[PDB]
Design a protein around this nucleic acid. Structure first.
Ligand SMILES: [Ca+2]
Length: 579
DNA sequence: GCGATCAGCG
DNA sequence: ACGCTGATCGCA
C-alpha cells in the first residue's frame, strides 16, 4: 500500500543531497548489533536497500559519510553507533525526529517513529512493536514486510521534519535542537563507541575479597538473629526484626514492614543486627551490580564496556546511562569507591582527566532567582554546603566531616525544592518545630529564592509548563489538579525542573564547545563519560598540562550567568585517582 | 513485571 | 511530606 523500489544495487538517484534515512537496528542495545535493512526517501522516490550490498557499495558509504549530504532520521545515534561498529561513518544528519519529539514534549515517551508521528496526526506507519513483536516472539519479519515498515518510517520522517521544525521555532526550541541536542548526539555516539577500558583482574579480585567478607557478616547476622533466614527476603527479615526481635516499627510499605536504610539507621540503638544488615546489603550491592554486573558486559577482546547514553528519556533534559549505568559508580564510601580503580585509560601512557561543576544548581538558582544573598555567596566562591554544615551541627569549618557535608547538601537542595518540616526533621533527627524554624530562617537569608519558588509555581499554572534557560520545556498538567497530593508533586516539579534542566543545558553546551576546542588544538584527548555535572576524558599524559587549562576554561565559559561557574579537575592513572 | 531498595547526580 | 535516574532481586 506504499510504493517503493526494492533495490538490488545503489543507483545515483538514491544519493540526493537531501534524504530521509532509516538504518534499522532492532536490538535494544545497538553496540555491535546487526543492521537489518535500510530505507531512503528523497525527491526521486522511496528505496529499500539490503545492508549487505548497500554497506559494501563505495558510493553509498561515501554518501553516508558526506556531511554535505543531509539526512533526516529518527534516533540517529543508534544508527551512527551501529555503523561505527561496521567501520562506517555517518555524517550530515540535520534532523533527528526523536530529539525533536523529546524537546516538544518529554512526557510523550516517544519510542519510535509512529509515536512521534501521532503528535502530528500522521499514522501511515506502524509501531515498531506491532512489526517486530515483543519478548521471545521478537523477530525480523519477512523482507517485503520489513521493507515497507522501513520505507513507511522514512516517508514519515520525510513528511514530519517541516511541522516539527515549525513547532520547535514557535517554542523557541529550534536552536536547542540544531545547535545543542543534534551536535551532542554525534558526541555521545563517539563516547559510546570509544568505550571505557576496565581492569578485569582488579575487578575479579575485589569480588573474591567480597565473597569472603559477605559470609563473615552473614554468619554474624544469623548469630545475632539467633537463627538463619533469607536476609534479602523482606518477608523473613521483617519477621526477624519486628516480630522475633520485636524492634519498633517506624514505617510500613504497601506490602509490609519497611527495612530501608533510614529505618535501620534509627534502630541501631535498639540492636546490633541492624548495622550488620546494612553492611551486608552494601557489600551485596557492590557484588551484584558493580562486580558481577560490570564483568557481564565487558567485551572480552578489548576489555571495554560500552554504555548507552539515553538522550531522550529524562523529563528534565539530563542524560541517563544504561547497561552498564556508568553514572552511578560508587564513590561515597571507601570500600565501594575502589571499584573506580578498575576504570583505566584505553592506551598505555594515557591518563584519565575528570572535570566537574561545583554546586551547579545553586549557581543556576542564584542566577534565575536573582537572589541578592545567594548571588553574593557565589561571587565570594563560598561553599554553601560547608557553611550549611557549620550552621546545622554548630561546628566550625575545620570540624565539618564529609558525612556532615553530605547531609547539609541534602538540606540545601531539599529546602529550595520544597522539603517539608516533617521530611527535614526526619533527615536531621530534630524536632518538627526546629525544622520549620530552620526552614523559615533559611528563607529569611534567601527571600529571593522564596519569591522564585512562588513565582515559578504560579507561572506553571498560567502557562501550563516550565522552561529552562535554553528553552527546554516540561508540561505540568497536574499543577492545577484538585487532588492535593497530585498537585503538590507537580508544584515541586515546577521548582526543580527549570533548575536541574538548566544545569543539564549548561553541561551539554560545555561538551559541544569542548569537542570543538579539542579539535582546533589538535589534541588526541577525547570524552569518555558525562555524569550530570562532570566530564571524564582520557588523553596522552603529555596533554595533561594543556587540559588543565583548556577544560576548566571551556566549562566555565559555556554560558554567562550573573554568578561565576566554578570547575574542579583532577587527573590520574585511573578514574579513582582522578579526584 | 513491580516495587522496595540503594548506587549516583543535583 | 525535596528532584532526576538504573540495576538488582524477591515477590508480602
Ligand atoms: Ca560536582
Amino acid at each position: 500500500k506504499m510504493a517503493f523500489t526494492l533495490a538490488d544495487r545503489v543507483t545515483e538517484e538514491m544519493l540526493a543531497d537531501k534524504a530521509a534515512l532509516v538504518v534499522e537496528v532492532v536490538e535494544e542495545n545497538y553496540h555491535d548489533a546487526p543492521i537489518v535493512g535500510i530505507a531512503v526517501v528523497n525527491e526521486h522516490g522511496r528505496f529499500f536497500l539490503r545492508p549487505e550490498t548497500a554497506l559494501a557499495d563505495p558510493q553509498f558509504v561515501a554518501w553516508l559519510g558526506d556531511e554535505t549530504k543531509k539526512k533526516s532520521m529518527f534516533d540517529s545515534k543508534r544508527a551512527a553507533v551501529a555503523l561505527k561498529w561496521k567501520g562506517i561513518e555517518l555524517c550530515g544528519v540535520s534532523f533527528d525526529l526523536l530529539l525533536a519529539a523529546y524537546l516538544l514534549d518529554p512526557a510523550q515517551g516517544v519510542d519510535d517513529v509512529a509515536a512521534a508521528a501521532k503528535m502530528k496526526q500522521y499514522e501511515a506507519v506502524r509501531p515498531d512493536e506491532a512489526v517486530y513483536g515483543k519478548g521471545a516472539k521478537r523477530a525480523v519479519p519477512d523482507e517485503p514486510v520489513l521493507a515497507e515498515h522501513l520505507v513507511r518510517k522514512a516517508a514519515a520522517i520525510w513528511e514530519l521534519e517541516r511541522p516539527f521544525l515549525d513547532e520547535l521555532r514557535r517554542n523557541e526550541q529550534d536552536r536547542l535542537l540544531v545547535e545543542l541536542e543534534q551536535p551532542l548526539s554525534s558526541i555521545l555516539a563517539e563516547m559510546e563507541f570509544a568505550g571505557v577500558k576496565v581492569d578485569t583482574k582488579r575487578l575479579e579480585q575485589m569480588g573474591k575479597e567480597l565473597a569472603e567478607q559477605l559470609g563473615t557478616v552473614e554468619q554474624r547476622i544469623y548469630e545475632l538473629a539467633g537463627q538463619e533466614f533469607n536476609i534479602n527476603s523482606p518477608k523473613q527479615l521483617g519477621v526477624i526484626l519486628f516480630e522475633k526481635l520485636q524492634l519498633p516499627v517506624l514505617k510500613k510499605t504497601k506490602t509490609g514492614y519497611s527495612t530501608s536504610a533510614d529505618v535501620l539507621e534509627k534502630l541501631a540503638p535498639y540492636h546490633e543486627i541492624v548495622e550488620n544488615i546494612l553492611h551486608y546489603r552494601q557489600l551485596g550491592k557492590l557484588q551484584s551490580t558493580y562486580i558481577e554486573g560490570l564483568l557481564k558486559v565487558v567485551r572480552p577482546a578489548t576489555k571495554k564496556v560500552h554504555t548507552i547514553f539515553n538522550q531522550a528519556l529524562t523529563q528534565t533534559g539530563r542524560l541517563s546511562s544504561t547497561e552498564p549505568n556508568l553514572q552511578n559508580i560508587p564513590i561515597r564510601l571507601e570500600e565501594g569507591r575502589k571499584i573506580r580503580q578498575a576504570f583505566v585509560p584505553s592506551e598505555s601512557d594515557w591518563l584519565i582527566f575528570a572535570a566537574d561543576y561545583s554546586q551547579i544548581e545553586l549557581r543556576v538558582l542564584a542566577h534565575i532567582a536573582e537572589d541578592d544573598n545567594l548571588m553574593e555567596a557565589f561571587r565570594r566562591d563560598l561553599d554553601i554546603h560547608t557553611k550549611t554544615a557549620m550552621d546545622i551541627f554548630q561546628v566550625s569549618e575545620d570540624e565539618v566531616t564529609p558525612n556532615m557535608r553530605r547531609q547539609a547538601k541534602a538540606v540545601n537542595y531539599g529546602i529550595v525544592y520544597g522539603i517539608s518540616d516533617y521530611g527535614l526533621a526526619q533527615n536531621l533527627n530534630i524536632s518538627r518545630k526546629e525544622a520549620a524554624e530552620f526552614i523559615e530562617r533559611y528563607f529569611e537569608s534567601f527571600p529571593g529564592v522564596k519569591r522564585y519558588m512562588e513565582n515559578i509555581v504560579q507561572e506553571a499554572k498560567q502557562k501550563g509548563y516550565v522552561t529552562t534557560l535554553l528553552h527546554r520545556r516540561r508540561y505540568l498538567p497536574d499543577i492545577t489538579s484538585r487532588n492535593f497530593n497530585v498537585r503538590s508533586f507537580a508544584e515541586r516539579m515546577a521548582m526543580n525542573t527549570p533548575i536541574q534542566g538548566s544545569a543539564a543545558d549548561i553541561i551539554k553546551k560545555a561538551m559541544i564547545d569542548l569537542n570543538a576546542r579539542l579539535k582546533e588544538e589538535r589534541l588526541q584527548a577525547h570524552l569518555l563519560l558525562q555524569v550530570h555535572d562532570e566530564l571524564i576524558l582520557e588523553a596522552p599524559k603529555e596533554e595533561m598540562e594543556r587540559l588543565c587549562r583548556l577544560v576548566p576554561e571551556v566549562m566555565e565559559q559555556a554560558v554567562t550567568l550573573r554568578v561565576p561557574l566554578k570547575v574542579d579537575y583532577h587527573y590520574g592513572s585511573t578514574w579513582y585517582d582522578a579526584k
